[PDB]
Write an enzyme that holds these catalytic residues in place. Structure first.
Site, PDB file in Angstrom:
ATOM      1  N   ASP A 117     -34.780 -22.144  21.021  1.00 53.77           N
ATOM      2  CA  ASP A 117     -33.475 -22.700  20.741  1.00 53.77           C
ATOM      3  C   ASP A 117     -33.622 -24.219  20.685  1.00 53.77           C
ATOM      4  O   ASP A 117     -34.077 -24.827  21.658  1.00 53.77           O
ATOM      5  CB  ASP A 117     -32.493 -22.302  21.841  1.00 53.77           C
ATOM      6  CG  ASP A 117     -31.102 -22.802  21.577  1.00 53.77           C
ATOM      7  OD1 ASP A 117     -30.647 -22.682  20.423  1.00 53.77           O
ATOM      8  OD2 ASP A 117     -30.470 -23.328  22.516  1.00 53.77           O
TER       9      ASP A 117
ATOM     10  N   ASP B 224     -31.266 -27.415  20.190  1.00 52.31           N
ATOM     11  CA  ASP B 224     -29.878 -27.856  20.136  1.00 52.31           C
ATOM     12  C   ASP B 224     -29.835 -29.373  20.037  1.00 52.31           C
ATOM     13  O   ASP B 224     -30.542 -30.085  20.759  1.00 52.31           O
ATOM     14  CB  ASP B 224     -29.118 -27.385  21.373  1.00 52.31           C
ATOM     15  CG  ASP B 224     -28.874 -25.900  21.377  1.00 52.31           C
ATOM     16  OD1 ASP B 224     -29.141 -25.242  20.345  1.00 52.31           O
ATOM     17  OD2 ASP B 224     -28.397 -25.403  22.421  1.00 52.31           O
TER      18      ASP B 224
ATOM     19  N   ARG C 262     -40.140 -14.703  15.788  1.00 48.95           N
ATOM     20  CA  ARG C 262     -39.911 -13.360  15.269  1.00 48.95           C
ATOM     21  C   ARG C 262     -38.424 -13.111  15.420  1.00 48.95           C
ATOM     22  O   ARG C 262     -37.996 -12.302  16.243  1.00 48.95           O
ATOM     23  CB  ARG C 262     -40.680 -12.315  16.078  1.00 48.95           C
ATOM     24  CG  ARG C 262     -42.174 -12.243  15.799  1.00 48.95           C
ATOM     25  CD  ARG C 262     -42.802 -11.111  16.602  1.00 48.95           C
ATOM     26  NE  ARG C 262     -44.235 -10.967  16.356  1.00 48.95           N
ATOM     27  CZ  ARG C 262     -45.167 -11.744  16.899  1.00 48.95           C
ATOM     28  NH1 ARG C 262     -44.819 -12.735  17.709  1.00 48.95           N
ATOM     29  NH2 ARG C 262     -46.447 -11.535  16.627  1.00 48.95           N
TER      30      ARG C 262
ATOM     31  N   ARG D 276     -35.134 -15.117  24.098  1.00 50.99           N
ATOM     32  CA  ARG D 276     -35.158 -15.790  22.808  1.00 50.99           C
ATOM     33  C   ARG D 276     -36.346 -16.738  22.723  1.00 50.99           C
ATOM     34  O   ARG D 276     -36.629 -17.511  23.647  1.00 50.99           O
ATOM     35  CB  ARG D 276     -33.846 -16.534  22.614  1.00 50.99           C
ATOM     36  CG  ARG D 276     -33.756 -17.328  21.346  1.00 50.99           C
ATOM     37  CD  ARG D 276     -32.315 -17.749  21.138  1.00 50.99           C
ATOM     38  NE  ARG D 276     -32.167 -18.734  20.079  1.00 50.99           N
ATOM     39  CZ  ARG D 276     -31.004 -19.282  19.755  1.00 50.99           C
ATOM     40  NH1 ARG D 276     -29.917 -18.937  20.431  1.00 50.99           N
ATOM     41  NH2 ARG D 276     -30.934 -20.169  18.772  1.00 50.99           N
TER      42      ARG D 276
HETATM   43  N1  APC Z   1     -25.095 -29.686  18.456  1.00 48.61           N
HETATM   44  C1  APC Z   1     -25.520 -28.561  17.863  1.00 48.61           C
HETATM   45  N2  APC Z   1     -26.836 -28.226  17.888  1.00 48.61           N
HETATM   46  C2  APC Z   1     -27.199 -27.061  17.323  1.00 48.61           C
HETATM   47  N3  APC Z   1     -26.458 -26.146  16.701  1.00 48.61           N
HETATM   48  C3  APC Z   1     -25.164 -26.494  16.695  1.00 48.61           C
HETATM   49  C4  APC Z   1     -24.634 -27.659  17.227  1.00 48.61           C
HETATM   50  N4  APC Z   1     -23.251 -27.712  17.030  1.00 48.61           N
HETATM   51  C5  APC Z   1     -22.970 -26.594  16.398  1.00 48.61           C
HETATM   52  N5  APC Z   1     -24.071 -25.821  16.163  1.00 48.61           N
HETATM   53  C6  APC Z   1     -24.058 -24.545  15.463  1.00 48.61           C
HETATM   54  O1  APC Z   1     -24.386 -23.497  16.386  1.00 48.61           O
HETATM   55  C7  APC Z   1     -24.803 -22.407  15.531  1.00 48.61           C
HETATM   56  C8  APC Z   1     -25.376 -21.298  16.371  1.00 48.61           C
HETATM   57  O2  APC Z   1     -26.569 -21.761  17.035  1.00 48.61           O
HETATM   58  P1  APC Z   1     -27.160 -20.907  18.244  1.00 48.61           P
HETATM   59  O3  APC Z   1     -28.461 -21.542  18.574  1.00 48.61           O
HETATM   60  O4  APC Z   1     -27.188 -19.477  17.883  1.00 48.61           O
HETATM   61  C9  APC Z   1     -26.030 -21.191  19.607  1.00 48.61           C
HETATM   62  P2  APC Z   1     -26.855 -21.303  21.194  1.00 48.61           P
HETATM   63  O5  APC Z   1     -27.740 -22.522  21.236  1.00 48.61           O
HETATM   64  O6  APC Z   1     -27.499 -19.990  21.516  1.00 48.61           O
HETATM   65  O7  APC Z   1     -25.667 -21.537  22.240  1.00 48.61           O
HETATM   66  P3  APC Z   1     -25.232 -22.956  22.933  1.00 48.61           P
HETATM   67  O8  APC Z   1     -24.840 -23.875  21.803  1.00 48.61           O
HETATM   68  O9  APC Z   1     -24.104 -22.549  23.869  1.00 48.61           O
HETATM   69  O10 APC Z   1     -26.432 -23.484  23.661  1.00 48.61           O
HETATM   70  C10 APC Z   1     -25.730 -23.084  14.536  1.00 48.61           C
HETATM   71  O11 APC Z   1     -25.984 -22.331  13.386  1.00 48.61           O
HETATM   72  C11 APC Z   1     -25.008 -24.399  14.276  1.00 48.61           C
HETATM   73  O12 APC Z   1     -24.256 -24.340  13.049  1.00 48.61           O
HETATM   74 MG    MG Z   2     -28.399 -23.444  23.076  1.00 51.05          MG
HETATM   75 MG    MG Z   3     -28.848 -23.319  19.607  1.00 53.57          MG
END
Ligand code: APC
Ligand code: MG
Ligand code: MG
Ligand code: CL
Length: 158
Positions: free
Chosen positions: A95, A97, A82, A92
């Site tokens: 996430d 990554d 959501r 959140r």
């Molecule tokens: N290795 C990676 N994995 C995921 N997103 C990445 C990335 N490198 C850059 N990004 C970018 O990060 C942008 C924002 O993602 P978010 O998930 O909002 C950051 P977050 O995960 O909250 O913080 P963090 O990266 O400090 O953990 C994405 O839209 C993407 O373009």
């Molecule tokens: Mg993150």
């Molecule tokens: Mg992220």
């Protein structure tokens, strides 16, 4: 290629969100899950009153390009949660990554790999070590040697 993806959730029953995310990750094209770490509990780091997070790591085999994988992980976040503006500063649902994409170094606006802060995050390093104890980073540093400093407590399981 094997991509290593960090999964975190601290909203809407984190175990539900993580297991749902795994199902979605298993549905990414030209890819399939090799293994998944145990699930680790991470208390909030700081003064904000947020739920404990569930953190994990997944090894995903893929023939996708790095940017194509990112397309899919972003899609999963957008579809499953959501999604709210407020998730950027509060609890959140999901996430995803990209920690590592094989042994590749990617420095682009959209995508930075290795993840820019993962070497400072026990909640990324420990689950990664569980699934890839022999891992060596693109800069040549061994994951085991980083953790053997004992700079990072081994997190409790979920
Ligand atoms: N290795 C990676 N994995 C995921 N997103 C990445 C990335 N490198 C850059 N990004 C970018 O990060 C942008 C924002 O993602 P978010 O998930 O909002 C950051 P977050 O995960 O909250 O913080 P963090 O990266 O400090 O953990 C994405 O839209 C993407 O373009
Ligand atoms: Mg993150
Ligand atoms: Mg992220
Ligand atoms: Cl590196």
């Amino acid at each position: 290629t094997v991509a290593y993806i960090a999964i975190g959730s601290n909203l809407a029953s984190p175990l539900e969100q993580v297991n749902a995310a795994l199902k979605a990750l298993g549905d990414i094209p030209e890819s399939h899950i090799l293994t998944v770490s145990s699930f680790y509990r991470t208390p909030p780091l700081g003064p904000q009153d947020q739920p404990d997070a569930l953190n994990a790591a997944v090894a995903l085999e893929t023939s996708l390009a790095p940017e194509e994988l990112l397309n899919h992980t972003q899609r999963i976040e957008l579809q499953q949660g959501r999604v709210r503006k407020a998730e950027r500063w509060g609890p959140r649902t999901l996430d995803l990554d990209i920690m590592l994409f094989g042994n590749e170094v990617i420095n682009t606006e959209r995508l930075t790999v290795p993840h820019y802060d993962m070497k400072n995050r026990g909640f990324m390093l420990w689950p990664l070590f569980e699934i890839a104890p022999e891992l060596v980073f693109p800069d040549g540093e061994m994951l085991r040697q980083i953790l053997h400093t004992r700079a990072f407590d081994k997190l409790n399981k979920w």
